[PDB]
């Protein structure tokens, strides 16, 4: 027979990709009440966070105020690189002056990125994130390897982003201290549409973990998360931390401009590959928009960790390491409709559901 | 090969979960006209109802008036536990003073729940429902077992909620007289979203029944039901009764406040894990809302049992026990669209379809 | 392993049901241009129609004017039975007085239905349709068998409706001259929702045909059709004719009341199991509504047969009998979106697409 | 067992058809930055384009201005045939007078189409496109074969449209220099709805390529494309070029009338099988509408090629021939929702996403 989906090559369509809305965690036998769950997890090989959450390296999400707030809440911020090197380094210093808090900073690849990285290290950064649209190439692997060789002793080096097992494996071989996963799932991202390229985020995590976990390298699940439950799903798929843009962009600490329209409150949120971000040869792979204002970061993080704690209680996971062993059930569109509230008019805002 | 959905573990995504909108009952050879169908079914091992329906233990669904009405209609109510012990016990007495009608009452786990249970038994309750978000743990199993040991002679003890075969089996082993199934399907429930945890309700029923039916323990299908046909589906999947919140919350007998907006009529309906219910450490797993007013309970129950009777006629099921042996066909989104009315503007309200 | 969808019984969920929007006909080698296609097909064992279309036996679709128009267009009407026996018989006579045109009439089961049938035969009806919600029972089979024994010589006897192979086989064994398929697909039908019972219409046809075709008994595909392409699909699945309600209810010849609202034109269309039809013990299994006015029947039939002719050209089918051998490809929701016009604002009405 | 979808014939439903929104390209190891990608590709056996894009032969898409613009941008236009032969030939001459640019022209089948073809060849056309709704028949195959025999030396001859392996193979055997694929995917097309016939476009490409690629015959993927990413998908499925209607109809160079409604700007765009096009025996297989105005063609083509270049960078494809070897992952509806921007209000127009 021909392949059921066309042509004669069984490997042309190589797998079925799932994302967060395709799966649910199965409850299991539990001696863990949400209050007693330990939410700590490895950000990188050497760095463990109290709360397994980091803020996106975006000019509408993370600058010093967000980095400070995230660290105090037990996570970490990654300072964006859409600003001069001296300014990014200064923001690292600001976070460092606020109580020796952990902080990360994004860099690109090449000579200017090298100088940026060295200035960030001098400023006391804890984590360098080599942050690129496509990490599966010699330029990114060389950057990760060279950084580890030169400053690896004082700084952890993260590489990303990937969406496959082989790209995750290449980053592991280059010496990455963590691997960041996500090609296209971002709320403001058009990569999958403009280039046609990506992998659904749950499958991308499962695949990257298949390479990283046996090598003891933590995986950061970056993009596509919209609810506390999605964080539990990402970790159960094998990630060690989750990176958030949209969920944090509406908070007081995000550096986006505060917007008032139709008697409502918003903040700007835009892709770093949007036309506006690139200006402030490649065609854009993001859009510019706004998200509703969500109040203080601390309260958002509390709701997110609370949802994670519930998941740990339901699945009998005393630690994140046990949560990573939980099982999924795949669901249909009807299952998804059933999972959200349905057939009711919401009359009151919930702090963890809008 | 890697698993088609990612990673190398075939059991990571353990099954495909179906819910009501994913399946239809197949018609079969029949000598049963709807009028002659026997809708009676076991609520628990010792208690058989004339109509296999019970009202949810929620502060917007079941208080004494609902409990009285449900019992008179041939089902039963489960009195909610969001009120002082003396008041819940008093409501049991009110139902009991109205003609020796059957009544159930929810309790939690722990010392206060124990005192509540003893007061309810003293008041003459027929069924205690140990009613928890997650029953697969020693606390709930111990509560069920201790209740059966102490008052098991005069009261039936139900345990819930579960969504897996193993959790249903644990409750059976603890001595449960029925097992209640449903993690996340409720109309006002956000568990699946906030915690990421659950199982689509048809599969959850099939799995629980695989453990309960061979032990002679009835399964209560709790949550997610929106039409009379869904009740037939739940029973065919193997449940013995169905528990309803949304479908009954809009009735005259529900204790929710009656609301007038936009020239229309509603009643409040809220999750017992909503912020408003919890107040009146855990983050909410429900929302607060309203549902349209549906009139007297009796008329709603008549329409629901009528739909069930039709299903029994179509499937050749003279009893609920035979309905539990019916077969399903799985359907696609197109099948679902075809099942509901389509391509027509409804001009008149139907008593059993809105 | 447990069954992937739950429980331990592989046959509990017995198959995957497809309907019209799930499939497309594959083009094939062709020496048939649409103009040369022969659209004739068996309505029953003895009766062949020029156009393989019949109008539904509904009080908002078929009375004498529709029956006359359908016959003149090369199809047939089935006169509804929601009126006194003498009136239904009179309408048969009216059609018969209009040029010896073919006509059918619906009857139920039991004594009154028997008298109705005899009066219809006396009036010259060509086809009796034993027309019931569920045909898989002794009452319907006996009616079909008795009618064939008593008047089978002068009248063709159709039985319906079924949605399974075994029910189709029972009707064949009872002596049915055609078998009508459709449990729940109707536009105004709530059977699948109220009772939870049915089978998606393409699979229902495939299954019924598996029983009827080897016995030389034509299958009438009844309900769910919305476009000319759906007719081609039904016939390719193995049906010999298609029965239409919605598509014909908006025509001038339908007996529904003509409605003017919002500067637009509609006609009433209602299920025969709607509360309004039943009045003019069972709960309703239909709704009451309206459909847009579509003009003269002849023009609608021309567009429908034109679409069928195109399908025959694409599939290389010179006759309906060859069309019944065509192949399908199954499609996804994306495939369905692609099939309809997309990403364009329609500015002009098309005669065969709204 | 019966076939899981109904009946006893395993080949009745022959395969599962995918289209663009069902798949994503997997990133791969890459030494190709978008800037260095070579986007050139074969239009036909003898003609290679700098940009693998051609404009649809439609009266609202391609006349001389569009043909000139496409050629200058490195693609080609196919002049439509809904106008007198002398006028179509004149437009060929106009394009030819503008710098020896490449140009194609559509013809039908039969005597008038033959005269049209000869006049187009005399006028200097580079490519004749035998352009029919259904190419799998002797009339079209004879036309292709006769054209190749008579003028094959000076002109390339394309045949279409097909949606199957066997029809593609027949065109290859007839001597086609390229095969054009697409039955029903067009934005303005109702073929799949009116006739019920077609195949989802990715599967159609895979199937046609299975016949054409081993014979060295390029495949033109015609219809259904809405984003730059879709072009990358079509080429990865094995096509050598993509034909665009909707994406180009809104450009300044399209010959559609410019429309002003609601303070917005549109241009007319209609199917060539719409009632309006056919007039200016068959029932229509297209609709008439409008699309938003998109500005100069050059800027649209730049955005489209930019997206393609990104895909080549992500997949490590230095040439289109390597892109044709890329792998897909199949996605679910959740995956598709995740791929587009989600959970954000777009506040600024993006040049490559609306
Ligand atoms: C314009 C786009 N921006 C972008 C995309 C995803 C996420 C974020 Cl945060 C951003 Cl700012 C991009 O970098 N696109 C892009 C698209 C494809 C690329 O391929 C290679 C590359 C680099 C080195 N060797 C081989 C390939 N680099 C590429 C860059
Ligand atoms: C806040 C939430 N409320 C809720 C959830 C579902 C339905 C209803 Cl009616 C309600 Cl009121 C809840 O109880 N969440 C929750 C979430 C996870 C839990 O895990 C354990 C637990 C208890 C004892 N041992 C182990 C785990 N208890 C848990 C409780
Ligand atoms: C009320 C409903 N009406 C209806 C349903 C489908 C299509 C149409 Cl046109 C109509 Cl008017 C109906 O007849 N429901 C119904 C529902 C289930 C039934 O089971 C049996 C039956 C009859 C004889 N033996 C066994 C079962 N008869 C049944 C009748
Ligand atoms: C009316 C329709 N128009 C149309 C359809 C698809 C795309 C475009 Cl651009 C157009 Cl203008 C059409 O040509 N329909 C149609 C539909 C089925 C046909 O079958 C044969 C045919 C021709 C020669 N031998 C056998 C079959 N020719 C057929 C033509
Ligand atoms: O413009 C872009 N194109 C593609 N991805 C982006 C772009 N900007 C940010 N991202 C990614 O999207 C993530 C945020 O996704 P979110 O949490 O779903 O909003 C970031 O952490 C980046 O990985
Ligand atoms: O806040 C909550 N979170 C989760 N489930 C709830 C909550 N409150 C009530 N439930 C469940 O939802 C069921 C009612 O679902 P419904 O019939 O779909 O509205 C109840 O019987 C409980 O099992
Ligand atoms: O009230 C009803 N309930 C269920 N089916 C109905 C009812 N009334 C008519 N039908 C069926 O629906 C068909 C018409 O479907 P339509 O062509 O999709 O509108 C009829 O030919 C009957 O088989
Ligand atoms: O009326 C029609 N019916 C069917 N297909 C059409 C019709 N007119 C144009 N087409 C096809 O649709 C393609 C354009 O599709 P689009 O790029 O999705 O708008 C053309 O290149 C033709 O192959
Ligand atoms: K829910
Ligand atoms: K229906
Ligand atoms: K289309
Ligand atoms: K996205």
mmCIF file of C-alpha atoms in Angstrom, chain A residues 9-144:
data_model
loop_
_atom_site.group_PDB
_atom_site.id
_atom_site.type_symbol
_atom_site.label_atom_id
_atom_site.label_comp_id
_atom_site.label_asym_id
_atom_site.label_seq_id
_atom_site.Cartn_x
_atom_site.Cartn_y
_atom_site.Cartn_z
ATOM 1 C CA UNK A 9 7.729 7.129 2.238
ATOM 2 C CA UNK A 10 6.604 6.038 5.752
ATOM 3 C CA UNK A 11 8.930 8.592 7.346
ATOM 4 C CA UNK A 12 7.793 11.645 5.387
ATOM 5 C CA UNK A 13 5.241 12.423 8.085
ATOM 6 C CA UNK A 14 7.409 11.300 10.961
ATOM 7 C CA UNK A 15 5.132 11.538 13.992
ATOM 8 C CA UNK A 16 1.972 13.008 15.523
ATOM 9 C CA UNK A 17 2.684 16.156 17.521
ATOM 10 C CA UNK A 18 0.740 16.911 20.696
ATOM 11 C CA UNK A 19 0.544 20.098 22.691
ATOM 12 C CA UNK A 20 -0.867 21.119 26.070
ATOM 13 C CA UNK A 21 -4.554 21.063 25.115
ATOM 14 C CA UNK A 22 -4.142 17.507 23.744
ATOM 15 C CA UNK A 23 -3.361 15.881 27.086
ATOM 16 C CA UNK A 24 -4.335 15.661 30.738
ATOM 17 C CA UNK A 25 -2.409 14.298 33.690
ATOM 18 C CA UNK A 26 -3.890 11.147 35.210
ATOM 19 C CA UNK A 27 -4.541 11.268 38.962
ATOM 20 C CA UNK A 28 -2.600 8.637 40.861
ATOM 21 C CA UNK A 29 -2.211 7.244 44.354
ATOM 22 C CA UNK A 30 -0.992 10.077 46.547
ATOM 23 C CA UNK A 31 0.394 10.807 49.989
ATOM 24 C CA UNK A 32 1.121 14.385 48.956
ATOM 25 C CA UNK A 33 -1.221 17.184 49.883
ATOM 26 C CA UNK A 34 -0.715 20.360 47.847
ATOM 27 C CA UNK A 35 0.724 22.163 50.892
ATOM 28 C CA UNK A 36 3.538 19.619 51.302
ATOM 29 C CA UNK A 37 4.633 19.429 47.665
ATOM 30 C CA UNK A 38 8.210 20.583 46.974
ATOM 31 C CA UNK A 39 8.144 22.747 43.834
ATOM 32 C CA UNK A 40 11.944 23.182 43.589
ATOM 33 C CA UNK A 41 13.635 22.168 40.334
ATOM 34 C CA UNK A 42 16.857 22.482 38.363
ATOM 35 C CA UNK A 43 17.075 25.477 36.054
ATOM 36 C CA UNK A 44 20.500 24.282 34.935
ATOM 37 C CA UNK A 45 22.911 21.569 36.017
ATOM 38 C CA UNK A 46 24.210 23.670 38.906
ATOM 39 C CA UNK A 47 21.293 25.998 39.713
ATOM 40 C CA UNK A 48 18.101 24.899 41.509
ATOM 41 C CA UNK A 49 15.102 27.240 41.794
ATOM 42 C CA UNK A 50 12.475 27.245 44.549
ATOM 43 C CA UNK A 51 9.746 27.783 41.943
ATOM 44 C CA UNK A 52 10.299 26.243 38.474
ATOM 45 C CA UNK A 53 9.434 29.351 36.487
ATOM 46 C CA UNK A 54 11.461 31.858 34.516
ATOM 47 C CA UNK A 55 10.416 35.001 32.649
ATOM 48 C CA UNK A 56 10.976 35.348 28.883
ATOM 49 C CA UNK A 57 13.895 37.361 27.529
ATOM 50 C CA UNK A 58 11.627 39.884 25.829
ATOM 51 C CA UNK A 59 11.556 43.675 25.833
ATOM 52 C CA UNK A 60 7.940 43.606 26.990
ATOM 53 C CA UNK A 61 8.531 41.048 29.744
ATOM 54 C CA UNK A 62 11.876 41.129 31.507
ATOM 55 C CA UNK A 63 13.971 44.062 32.672
ATOM 56 C CA UNK A 64 15.418 44.574 36.122
ATOM 57 C CA UNK A 65 12.121 45.000 37.953
ATOM 58 C CA UNK A 66 10.773 41.732 36.594
ATOM 59 C CA UNK A 67 14.078 39.976 37.214
ATOM 60 C CA UNK A 68 14.089 41.173 40.837
ATOM 61 C CA UNK A 69 10.469 40.163 41.354
ATOM 62 C CA UNK A 70 10.875 36.708 39.805
ATOM 63 C CA UNK A 71 13.972 35.967 41.890
ATOM 64 C CA UNK A 72 12.222 37.064 45.079
ATOM 65 C CA UNK A 73 9.266 34.819 44.175
ATOM 66 C CA UNK A 74 11.708 31.918 43.864
ATOM 67 C CA UNK A 75 12.086 31.813 40.074
ATOM 68 C CA UNK A 76 14.375 33.833 37.820
ATOM 69 C CA UNK A 77 14.252 36.407 35.061
ATOM 70 C CA UNK A 78 16.210 36.387 31.831
ATOM 71 C CA UNK A 79 17.066 39.949 30.829
ATOM 72 C CA UNK A 80 16.363 40.653 27.169
ATOM 73 C CA UNK A 81 19.092 41.683 24.717
ATOM 74 C CA UNK A 82 17.241 44.331 22.697
ATOM 75 C CA UNK A 83 19.237 47.188 24.207
ATOM 76 C CA UNK A 84 22.875 48.324 24.366
ATOM 77 C CA UNK A 85 25.388 46.018 26.063
ATOM 78 C CA UNK A 86 26.191 48.551 28.802
ATOM 79 C CA UNK A 87 22.491 48.879 29.631
ATOM 80 C CA UNK A 88 21.895 45.131 29.804
ATOM 81 C CA UNK A 89 24.962 44.762 32.002
ATOM 82 C CA UNK A 90 23.724 47.618 34.186
ATOM 83 C CA UNK A 91 20.402 45.859 34.703
ATOM 84 C CA UNK A 92 22.276 42.733 35.808
ATOM 85 C CA UNK A 93 24.064 44.896 38.377
ATOM 86 C CA UNK A 94 20.738 46.354 39.551
ATOM 87 C CA UNK A 95 19.375 42.875 40.240
ATOM 88 C CA UNK A 96 22.637 41.917 41.927
ATOM 89 C CA UNK A 97 22.503 44.985 44.174
ATOM 90 C CA UNK A 98 19.055 43.878 45.371
ATOM 91 C CA UNK A 99 20.217 41.020 47.585
ATOM 92 C CA UNK A 100 22.464 38.717 45.562
ATOM 93 C CA UNK A 101 19.431 37.417 43.664
ATOM 94 C CA UNK A 102 19.852 34.991 40.754
ATOM 95 C CA UNK A 103 19.665 36.506 37.287
ATOM 96 C CA UNK A 104 20.081 35.429 33.663
ATOM 97 C CA UNK A 105 20.681 37.368 30.459
ATOM 98 C CA UNK A 106 20.209 36.535 26.797
ATOM 99 C CA UNK A 107 22.959 36.820 24.180
ATOM 100 C CA UNK A 108 23.066 35.998 20.480
ATOM 101 C CA UNK A 109 25.894 34.542 18.420
ATOM 102 C CA UNK A 110 28.986 36.184 16.956
ATOM 103 C CA UNK A 111 31.491 38.847 17.964
ATOM 104 C CA UNK A 112 29.107 41.464 19.365
ATOM 105 C CA UNK A 113 27.322 38.722 21.301
ATOM 106 C CA UNK A 114 30.677 37.622 22.700
ATOM 107 C CA UNK A 115 31.457 41.103 24.005
ATOM 108 C CA UNK A 116 27.930 41.284 25.433
ATOM 109 C CA UNK A 117 28.441 37.955 27.209
ATOM 110 C CA UNK A 118 31.792 39.017 28.724
ATOM 111 C CA UNK A 119 30.298 42.273 30.024
ATOM 112 C CA UNK A 120 27.367 40.353 31.535
ATOM 113 C CA UNK A 121 29.749 37.942 33.280
ATOM 114 C CA UNK A 122 31.748 40.896 34.627
ATOM 115 C CA UNK A 123 28.478 42.330 35.942
ATOM 116 C CA UNK A 124 27.820 39.125 37.878
ATOM 117 C CA UNK A 125 25.215 37.317 35.785
ATOM 118 C CA UNK A 126 24.504 33.746 36.906
ATOM 119 C CA UNK A 127 23.180 32.337 33.645
ATOM 120 C CA UNK A 128 23.921 33.143 30.026
ATOM 121 C CA UNK A 129 21.209 32.126 27.602
ATOM 122 C CA UNK A 130 22.390 31.688 24.028
ATOM 123 C CA UNK A 131 19.016 32.530 22.600
ATOM 124 C CA UNK A 132 18.347 31.934 18.912
ATOM 125 C CA UNK A 133 15.471 31.082 16.581
ATOM 126 C CA UNK A 134 17.251 27.927 15.450
ATOM 127 C CA UNK A 135 19.970 26.374 17.627
ATOM 128 C CA UNK A 136 20.757 23.379 15.416
ATOM 129 C CA UNK A 137 23.755 24.841 13.629
ATOM 130 C CA UNK A 138 27.497 25.279 14.088
ATOM 131 C CA UNK A 139 27.261 28.976 14.986
ATOM 132 C CA UNK A 140 25.124 28.365 18.078
ATOM 133 C CA UNK A 141 26.905 25.178 19.113
ATOM 134 C CA UNK A 142 30.273 26.937 18.825
ATOM 135 C CA UNK A 143 28.990 29.852 20.919
ATOM 136 C CA UNK A 144 27.785 27.519 23.660
#
